[PDB]
Structure formats: structure tokens, C-alpha cells
Design an enzyme around this catalytic site. Structure first.
Site, PDB file in Angstrom:
ATOM      1  N   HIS A  12      -5.900 -61.699   1.259  1.00  0.00           N
ATOM      2  CA  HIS A  12      -6.625 -60.689   2.026  1.00  0.00           C
ATOM      3  C   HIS A  12      -7.401 -59.646   1.237  1.00  0.00           C
ATOM      4  O   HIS A  12      -8.153 -58.886   1.820  1.00  0.00           O
ATOM      5  CB  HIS A  12      -5.658 -59.952   2.953  1.00  0.00           C
ATOM      6  N   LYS A  41      -6.689 -72.956   7.369  1.00  0.00           N
ATOM      7  CA  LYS A  41      -6.227 -71.734   8.029  1.00  0.00           C
ATOM      8  C   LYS A  41      -7.304 -71.211   8.987  1.00  0.00           C
ATOM      9  O   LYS A  41      -8.373 -70.799   8.550  1.00  0.00           O
ATOM     10  CB  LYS A  41      -5.860 -70.669   6.992  1.00  0.00           C
ATOM     11  N   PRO A  42      -7.011 -71.197  10.297  1.00  0.00           N
ATOM     12  CA  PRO A  42      -8.024 -71.013  11.345  1.00  0.00           C
ATOM     13  C   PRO A  42      -8.770 -69.698  11.235  1.00  0.00           C
ATOM     14  O   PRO A  42      -9.992 -69.676  11.415  1.00  0.00           O
ATOM     15  CB  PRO A  42      -7.211 -71.039  12.645  1.00  0.00           C
ATOM     16  N   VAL A  43      -8.027 -68.614  10.996  1.00  0.00           N
ATOM     17  CA  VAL A  43      -8.620 -67.292  10.816  1.00  0.00           C
ATOM     18  C   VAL A  43      -7.983 -66.562   9.659  1.00  0.00           C
ATOM     19  O   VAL A  43      -6.779 -66.677   9.430  1.00  0.00           O
ATOM     20  CB  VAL A  43      -8.487 -66.403  12.068  1.00  0.00           C
ATOM     21  N   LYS A  66       1.850 -57.578  16.658  1.00  0.00           N
ATOM     22  CA  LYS A  66       1.483 -58.416  17.795  1.00  0.00           C
ATOM     23  C   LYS A  66       2.655 -59.239  18.283  1.00  0.00           C
ATOM     24  O   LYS A  66       2.711 -59.631  19.446  1.00  0.00           O
ATOM     25  CB  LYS A  66       0.331 -59.348  17.424  1.00  0.00           C
ATOM     26  N   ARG A  85     -13.586 -67.565  10.386  1.00  0.00           N
ATOM     27  CA  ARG A  85     -13.094 -68.370  11.485  1.00  0.00           C
ATOM     28  C   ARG A  85     -13.408 -69.849  11.272  1.00  0.00           C
ATOM     29  O   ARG A  85     -14.557 -70.213  11.049  1.00  0.00           O
ATOM     30  CB  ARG A  85     -13.724 -67.857  12.784  1.00  0.00           C
ATOM     31  N   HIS A 119      18.458 -39.565  -8.872  1.00  0.00           N
ATOM     32  CA  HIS A 119      19.424 -38.519  -9.198  1.00  0.00           C
ATOM     33  C   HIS A 119      20.791 -39.152  -9.410  1.00  0.00           C
ATOM     34  O   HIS A 119      21.181 -40.066  -8.681  1.00  0.00           O
ATOM     35  CB  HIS A 119      19.437 -37.442  -8.099  1.00  0.00           C
ATOM     36  N   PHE A 120      21.480 -38.715 -10.457  1.00  0.00           N
ATOM     37  CA  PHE A 120      22.833 -39.169 -10.720  1.00  0.00           C
ATOM     38  C   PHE A 120      23.826 -38.197 -10.076  1.00  0.00           C
ATOM     39  O   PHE A 120      23.814 -37.021 -10.362  1.00  0.00           O
ATOM     40  CB  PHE A 120      23.063 -39.291 -12.226  1.00  0.00           C
ATOM     41  N   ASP A 121      24.688 -38.702  -9.209  1.00  0.00           N
ATOM     42  CA  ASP A 121      25.541 -37.855  -8.375  1.00  0.00           C
ATOM     43  C   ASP A 121      26.949 -37.616  -8.939  1.00  0.00           C
ATOM     44  O   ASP A 121      27.420 -36.481  -8.966  1.00  0.00           O
ATOM     45  CB  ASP A 121      25.651 -38.444  -6.964  1.00  0.00           C
TER      46      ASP A 121
END
Lengths: 124, 124
Positions: A12, A41-43, A66, A85, A119-121
Site C-alpha cells: 500500500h 488481487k481485485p482491488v 468494515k 481495480r 521504568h524499573f519498579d
């Protein structure tokens, strides 16, 4: 393993033209981006904007997919896109396409798999 | 940027050793990793594991953070770590630290990202 984000990019993204060159563009690119292997691939739609501008859509208007999913987003501005197409005369192995250049808002599914430490807790 | 993810790495990652060389280790690393600038950071933990093994923890046991937050995860395995605690004789500009090498489960705050396109849905 092809990542979904690489597959999207391959199928794409086209930052190399600002517009479908001629009326052959889809026949070329659908060939080139490998969407004519095994089938036609149609479209398919190519987006002629930076990968930054396209990625930024993932942080814009949230709308519905969709198919019923919710991880779909819509571009604030329109984008230069090329709709390709499959035509009637198309028949694998000889896939033909119509090339159509438009400027429309796109809608994409935005996913991801990487969460990183920030961050290390504690230890335990 | 510096990304939060880079600040973590700088402050907490050490894949060059599997164990603290000596007892000066923290005085070296705390200084080198820029944690003795302006003030002395009272405590800090280094992890002697690959950046992959530490990242993957973000997709493991979700546990509660210490401040009440929920974006915290705990390591499936124990990890080789070095704790640096500021000592009694420590005083900026002269920060001294005590070095303790242990193997424990770590807990990190994960600031995930899910922002890439994976499917083109529609144009509009």
C-alpha cells in the site's frame, strides 16, 4: 515471517510517485508488489504520502472496520492514493487492472506488538 | 529523543557483564550512565541480561506497580541484577554506592506502543 506492518507497506505504500504515472501503473505495481502471484488481487490502494504521514493516521479519527472490528482509524486530511481495480478481461496468469488516481481520506487498521520498559519498579 | 525507553536502557541495562566486576562497579556505572549529575540517585538497578530478555518481560506476568499503576509486569525467570544504593559516606559531588549482585525477578513499567498500519480498509 512477513510482518503485517511490512505487508501493509509493501502492498500500500508508494512514496516514489506523487501520482500514478500513467494508465499502466496498477498493472506494474500489482506485478511488482507481488499481488498477482497465484491469483489477481481485485482491488488495492497505494498511498502517495510519506510513511510518517500515513503512520500518523493511527493517532487520528477512530472509526469502525468494515468487518466489525474497531482498530480502524481515519486520516484527518485527504491523501493522494491510487485505486487499482481488476478489469473484466483479467484472467490469471494475465492480470489486468484499471488505474485510478484520487484524493480521499483513507481508513486503515492500526495494530502493533511492541511494549517496552520505560521504568524499573522493583525486584522480587 | 531521549525516549523513555532509552532512559530506561541507559539507567538499567548492562549486557557487557553477567556480574558486577568489583564493589566499585556502581560508582563507575552510576557515574558513567549519567546518574550522578546534579544530584546523587539514591538507588538504581542494573540488569545483566540481553535487551531482548528484558523487553520480553513486558509481555509476561502483569503485577501491580508500587505507586498504584497497572502498567507493570514481572519476569517469568529471575535475572542477574546489580543493585546500587547510595552509602552513608555519599555526598554530592562525591556519590558513593554499595554494590549487591543478586538474581531476582524484576518488575518494570511498560509504556507500550501499538501504532502501525496492518491493513487498508477503505477510502472515503
Amino acid at each position: 515471517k512477513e510482518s503485517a506492518a511490512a505487508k501493509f507497506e509493501r502492498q500500500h505504500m508508494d512514496s516514489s510517485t506523487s501520482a500514478a504515472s500513467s494508465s499502466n501503473y496498477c498493472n506494474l505495481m500489482m506485478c511488482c508488489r507481488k499481488m498477482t502471484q497465484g491469483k489477481c488481487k481485485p482491488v488495492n490502494t497505494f498511498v502517495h504520502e510519506s510513511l510518517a504521514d500515513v503512520k500518523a493516521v493511527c493517532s487520528q479519527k477512530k472509526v469502525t472496520c468494515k468487518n466489525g472490528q474497531t482498530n480502524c482509524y481515519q486520516s484527518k486530511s485527504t491523501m493522494r492514493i491510487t485505486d487499482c481495480r481488476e478489469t473484466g478481461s483479467s484472467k490469471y496468469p494475465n492480470c489486468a487492472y484499471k488505474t485510478t488516481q484520487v484524493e480521499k481520506h483513507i481508513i486503515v487498521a492500526c495494530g502493533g506488538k511492541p511494549s517496552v520498559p520505560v521504568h524499573f519498579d522493583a525486584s522480587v
